[PDB]
Amino acid sequence: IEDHISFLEKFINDVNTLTAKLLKDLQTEYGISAEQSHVLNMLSIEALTVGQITEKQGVNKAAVSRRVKKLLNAELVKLEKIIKLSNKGKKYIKERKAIMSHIASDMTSDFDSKEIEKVRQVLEIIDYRIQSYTSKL
Amino acid sequence: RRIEDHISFLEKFINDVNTLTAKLLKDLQTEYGISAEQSHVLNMLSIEALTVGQITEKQGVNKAAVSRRVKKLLNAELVKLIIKLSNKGKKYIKERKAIMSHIASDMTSDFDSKEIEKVRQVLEIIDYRIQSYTSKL
Numbered sequence: 300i301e302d303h304i305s306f307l308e309k310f311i312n313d314v315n316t317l318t319a320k321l322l323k324d325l326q327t328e329y330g331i332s333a334e335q336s337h338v339l340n341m342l343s344i345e346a347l348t349v350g351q352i353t354e355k356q357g358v359n360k361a362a363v364s365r366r367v368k369k370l371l372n373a374e375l376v377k378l379e380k381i382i383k384l385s386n387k388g389k390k391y392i393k394e395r396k397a398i399m400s401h402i403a404s405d406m407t408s409d410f411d412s413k414e415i416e417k418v419r420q421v422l423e424i425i426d427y428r429i430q431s432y433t434s435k436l
Numbered sequence: 437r438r439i440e441d442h443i444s445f446l447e448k449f450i451n452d453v454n455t456l457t458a459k460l461l462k463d464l465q466t467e468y469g470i471s472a473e474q475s476h477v478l479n480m481l482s483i484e485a486l487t488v489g490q491i492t493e494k495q496g497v498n499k500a501a502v503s504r505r506v507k508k509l510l511n512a513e514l515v516k517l518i519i520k521l522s523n524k525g526k527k528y529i530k531e532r533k534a535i536m537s538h539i540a541s542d543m544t545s546d547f548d549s550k551e552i553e554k555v556r557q558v559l560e561i562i563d564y565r566i567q568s569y570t571s572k573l
């Protein structure tokens with residue numbers, strides 16, 4: 300009931316650890332922090348204003364702008380002004396998706412699609428509200 | 437790509453949760469004189485008293501980093517060197533649970549506890565498989 304909150308934190312921590320482990324080599328090849336790598340994955344989902352990314356990243360606006368500016372200096376991201384992945388940022392994300400999808404489908408292979416669907420619906424509602432809350436104060 | 441769609445959504449969901457949390461806890465962190473990342477090491481330590489190496493490979497980050505955050509926490513007296521929490525660190529974690537609890541609660545008080553629980557059940561196995569996978573590396 301609050302232990303649900305604790306569990307979600309444990310789960311997130313573990314996902315993050317797994318990702319950090321599965322993406323170790325790749326992020327070195329590109330010389331990118333998980334911090335930087337995260338924004339690309341973020342932009343991989345859809346384009347974004349530079350002001351919009353600040354809102355969907357939460358921490359200091361200044362921290363996020365520097366990271367975006369840093370991904371521009373590396374030419375992994377490009378302009379319109381909107382911010383989108385460069386052809387190079389795109390190749391990185393394909394390799395990232397390649398790995399993540401590989402293990403992800405290994406881990407859910409005994410799951411019937413309809414079990415995952417219903418679980419995904421409930422999380423979407425929660426993702427929705429999370430975003431609305433985030434939108435307000 | 438069916439699954440690949442589920443990872444993207446999962447990636448977006450986790451980023452949204454982290455963004456909310458950061459916004460929700462910014463003042464408490466500031467009141468205790470710490471940064472988000474320091475507060476993170478603190479929540480982990482609430483899970484259990486871990487040593488330096490443990491917190492480094494878990495979060496999956498470089499050398500100086502973790503140690504640096506831990507030196508700052510021990511100078512702020514929120515930790516007790518192993519590395520454990522202190523009455524003041526324990527107080528912070530408590531204040532954080534309360535905030536996260538009211539918020540999680542008011543964002544899920546219309547759900548079926550049977551609905552929340554089949555969801556928790558599916559995620560616990562995925563956490564369990566993530567965890568057993570991370571052992572292999």
Ligand SMILES: CC1(C)S[C@@H]2[C@H](NC(=O)Cc3ccccc3)C(=O)N2[C@H]1C(=O)O
Pocket residue numbers: 359361362363365
């Ligand atoms: C506003 C920020 C969140 S962003 C600013 C800067 N960010 C960096 O990453 C420092 C840096 C610059 C170039 C290369 C490496 C690191 C730095 O450090 N930063 C933060 C601050 O001082 O409040």
Ligand SMILES: CC1(C)S[C@@H]2[C@H](NC(=O)Cc3ccccc3)C(=O)N2[C@H]1C(=O)O
Pocket residue numbers: 315333451454455457458461472473474475476477479495
């Ligand atoms: C790998 C991380 C643990 S670092 C990023 C940020 N870190 C934090 O410490 C935020 C935080 C605030 C309060 C309690 C826990 C974590 C946060 O949230 N984080 C995870 C991420 O998605 O990268």
Ligand SMILES: C[As](C)(=O)[O-]
Pocket residue numbers: 374377384385386387
């Ligand atoms: C101009 As480009 C880095 O999107 O091929």
